[PDB]
Amino acid sequence: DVQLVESGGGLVQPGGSRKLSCSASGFAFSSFGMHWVRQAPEKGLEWVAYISSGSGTIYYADTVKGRFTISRDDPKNTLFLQMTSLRSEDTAMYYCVRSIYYYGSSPFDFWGQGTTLTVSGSDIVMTQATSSVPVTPGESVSISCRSSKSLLHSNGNTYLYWFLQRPGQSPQLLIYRMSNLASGVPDRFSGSGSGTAFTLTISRLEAEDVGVYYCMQHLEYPLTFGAGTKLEL
Amino acid sequence: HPKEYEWVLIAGYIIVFVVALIGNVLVCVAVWKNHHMRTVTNYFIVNLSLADVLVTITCLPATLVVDITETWFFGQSLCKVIPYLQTVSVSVSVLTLSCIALDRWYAICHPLMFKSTAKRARNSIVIIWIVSCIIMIPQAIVMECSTVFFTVCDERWGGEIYPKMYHICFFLVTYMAPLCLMVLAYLQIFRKLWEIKQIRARRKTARMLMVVLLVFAICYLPISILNVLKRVFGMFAHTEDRETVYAWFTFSHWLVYANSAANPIIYNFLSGKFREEFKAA
Amino acid sequence: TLSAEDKAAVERSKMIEKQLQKDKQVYRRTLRLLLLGADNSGKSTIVKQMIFETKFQVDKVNFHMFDVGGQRDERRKWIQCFNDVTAIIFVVDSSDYNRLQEALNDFKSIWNNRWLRTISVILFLNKQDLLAEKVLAGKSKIEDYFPEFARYTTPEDATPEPGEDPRVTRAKYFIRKEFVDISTASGDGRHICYPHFTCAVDTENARRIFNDCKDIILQMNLREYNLV
Amino acid sequence: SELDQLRQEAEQLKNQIRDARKACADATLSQITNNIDPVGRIQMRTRRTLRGHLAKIYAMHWGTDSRLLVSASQDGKLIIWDSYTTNKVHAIPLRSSWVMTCAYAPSGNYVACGGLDNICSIYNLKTREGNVRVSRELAGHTGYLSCCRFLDDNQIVTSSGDTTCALWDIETGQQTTTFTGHTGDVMSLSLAPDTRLFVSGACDASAKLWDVREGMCRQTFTGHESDINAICFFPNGNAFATGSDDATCRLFDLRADQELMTYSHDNIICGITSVSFSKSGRLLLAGYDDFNCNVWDALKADRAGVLAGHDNRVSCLGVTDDGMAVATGSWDSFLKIWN
Amino acid sequence: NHAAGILTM
Amino acid sequence: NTASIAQARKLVEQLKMEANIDRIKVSKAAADLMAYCEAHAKEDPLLTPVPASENPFR
């Protein structure tokens, strides 16, 4: 079946170096752009690296440019991130995220399982003004995510993605491009909005929908996530 | 004061002028207007025709007024810029005749290694133009308009060690190694092409290919042996017969422009397919 | 002014175009041959002794030969697909005198086809050993099926193979003349026919197809260079 | 004995339907559409040119959202293009290089193709693995198949060159209904807008109107003189226009049960390879063997413009569902968009 | 030198 | 030779089944084709050309 699994975590003292490996099993790895997305021990998501298909395009974040180096091995089916000059602000859990880009595709659809690494500006600030909503099972909930720059491109697409992370699991693509549901999601999740105001609405909320909901943009790199809204029951 | 020798010279110059210009511009506009003739074969032919109009408009009237008046009107700027354009256009047309012969040898004596690509034609045209512009820069540094006390537009080097080597390698570039490549290619195509209607129809091909080789190999002999006699071995310094030397040089230059006039006749208009594809445009 | 996903989509299109140009470089150097023939002609024994498609090699040249024969006797409509093949390998069972006139009519229908006005035919007069046995035995005449054979004599411009009777050679060159009459009486200049005599246990056929495709591509290149 | 009586009964029945078609024809289409104003000159220019194939293009089909199209070529490749930006969305390599047909599903999920290997391959584009995988292969036909048209994601109608059409159920694979009655190679079909009955044209110079749900041939139309090799429905589903090898198209009508109008010109001698209407039903487009398409004003039968620009034979042609383009694909490995 | 000023080619 | 008899009986049954359909006159069918072609005239971007602001193949 489709899975990505990564390893190479554990204790590193600062100034050191470490390599993380993400091995893919069950899809055509040579045609998928691959991202690395990290998560602090208590904060929300942030983007760290991206390598294209055929390795012809690489992007980094503003924090790790120059001290992280990403590459891929297509015959051996692996993704590598070689990190040198580690600070104490790289202690995180790293996720290896596939994404394929064509007309009508579904990027960021499968997320890895993540390694725990312990270490002893004209970008789009997606603000998410709510942080915790107490919910009951079987009620409509709406979650708001305001951008600062307008995300509606000239060709009509509104590049805003909605993710869900359950407690103790990896994040999952709920909605891609503000309205389209992802393949495998129940039909009660739906997204609405325009330009700089977006909203997710859930009808008949079950017990398996608690977690944190993130909104990512994808208009231009660096892809900046939101702070995430928790749904405590 | 013009002599009797130049009574027919100017007429022979203007007829090959108008024939070369008309024939080459109709070949280029026939390829440009029609769309079935933009094959991989007609890249070298239109490059040869642009080289031929550059030969007939940049080389012909300047050397005609020099070969009639022996007086240089154009000053040092044109005396620097004109012989560079002349040698560039002559060497481009000769090297693209060599690439035509090599392409025909690939497509007749080796038909099942499918070698003639369009990328190869583009690479060879770029290599011809680049090498021909790089080789002829000593025709642009050392040209001076010197008056002795008419006025000449000629070379002046430092020593007798460099220009002899430069003009012998120039003789090998613009006449000799093209002739060895062309003789090899067309001799092997002659050996391959020598039911009898088909044999009598593909024997005329070998005859006309040897005609193409002979028209190139005759119409560039005297000018190149005259340059390698004059610029290298230091002949034509102490002559009792200088007007004979002058008539030799203007006749050899007329042979060059006769070849540049005869190229679009023996390369395009003597084939039935090009006539039948020309009248549709 | 493209977005991020649009730039990645254009990069995907460029990688697809790179793979397609590699496949074009492989595809331009291969030679297709449409194989045709009757039911008792044994085209399959030629192909198996050297199933629609079959790929083989001579001297690092890739031949790709396909016998489309899973359909019925109306070949009139699917033959438009094969108008850019290199050659047509026609096979004749040249030892059955009763079923030979149908083979001649089929060759006349292949030669004068409006979609095959450029495609050359490599013609294999298969099963020569049975023809030799039937001529030297003297049981079944050829004059009963071809009345012109009473006035055919061998011409001086032929070279009989050593070891065979002159009657066998006369019959062989009569069959060969009967096919090249249909060859030469139409389409003079665009395509020709290369007849070879072939046994069943013979194994030199890939060399013969190689020489004939050499000649076919040579003639096509002499035509398309404004050179003929 | 009885066979002569059977042939005489068939002849008298054919005479009865001939007199019945004669009695129901009082005027013609040209005597009713004489007073309306004509179209005028039509100048459609090539917007996009899609260059990816290596050999001749044999069929194409627009997606149902009027943006994506699939095109199948003789070098053994389907290519799925996004026609607004000329990007290649997919490149699918085939198992056998001889493909004569192409179809896009009306959901956007599947793509079908078939050809000289008697087998309709159905490809599944939206997988969980990112590659295009052969979903299944339908094989029950006895000859080459020339046209495939999707009803929905579960059943497909195929017409093959052994004088038969079939309605396949993709989930199992066995054909559920076999439509027989032709006496020649069925060359093309086209489904109605309601997909309850379709029409198919063969090489016996006849087109037949089949009912999909029941399974019986309903009507036959004989007007031509050679092989019909293109057919398409008029958009309300009550007429269809056939294209043949005798250089003439014609428009038959289902309720009046006979031919209404013949589109031909004396300077046209080569056969038609593709026919499709426009969104109103007033531009009978046609692809010809003389390398250019012709646009016929389909109510007064006068011509109204050409679409030249192809170097070789136009083999396929299609109009989008919103009516805003015309894609013609021809044997010089090019598709071209016109509006 | 007599043969001076005559342009090559 | 009874298969020819079965095919002939099937063919004549096909013909008498094709003979018993109701047919409207050609004048009404031509009028309905004309009415449909003139009631959807404003919605045809090939007949009536649209301006280049609403034409996405520009």
Numbering used by the authors:
A (entry chain H): 1 to 120, 135 to 247
B (entry chain R): 49 to 197, 207 to 251, 292 to 378
C (entry chain A): 11 to 60, 207 to 254, 265 to 394
D (entry chain B): 2 to 340
E (entry chain L): 20 to 28
F (entry chain C): 5 to 62
Give the exact sentences the study uses for this entry:
OX1R and OX2R are class A G-protein-coupled receptors (GPCRs) of the β-branch that signal predominantly through heterotrimeric Gq/11 leading to increased cytosolic Ca2+ levels. In this work, we determined single-particle cryo-electron microscopy (cryo-EM) structures of OX2R–G-protein complexes bound to OxB and the small-molecule agonist 3′-(N-(3-(2-(2-(2H-1,2,3-triazol-2-yl)benzamido)ethyl)phenyl)sulfamoyl)-4′-methoxy-N,N-dimethyl-[1,1′-biphenyl]-3-carboxamide (compound 1) to further our understanding of orexin signaling and to enable structure-based drug discovery of novel therapeutics for the treatment of NT1.
To obtain a structure of OX2R activated by an endogenous peptide agonist, we purified the receptor in the presence of OxB and assembled a complex with mini-Gsqi, Gβ1γ2, and scFv16. The former is sandwiched between the sidechains of Y3437.32 and F3467.35, while the latter reaches into the narrow bottom of the pocket, interacting with a lipophilic patch formed by F2275.42, T2315.46, and I3206.51.
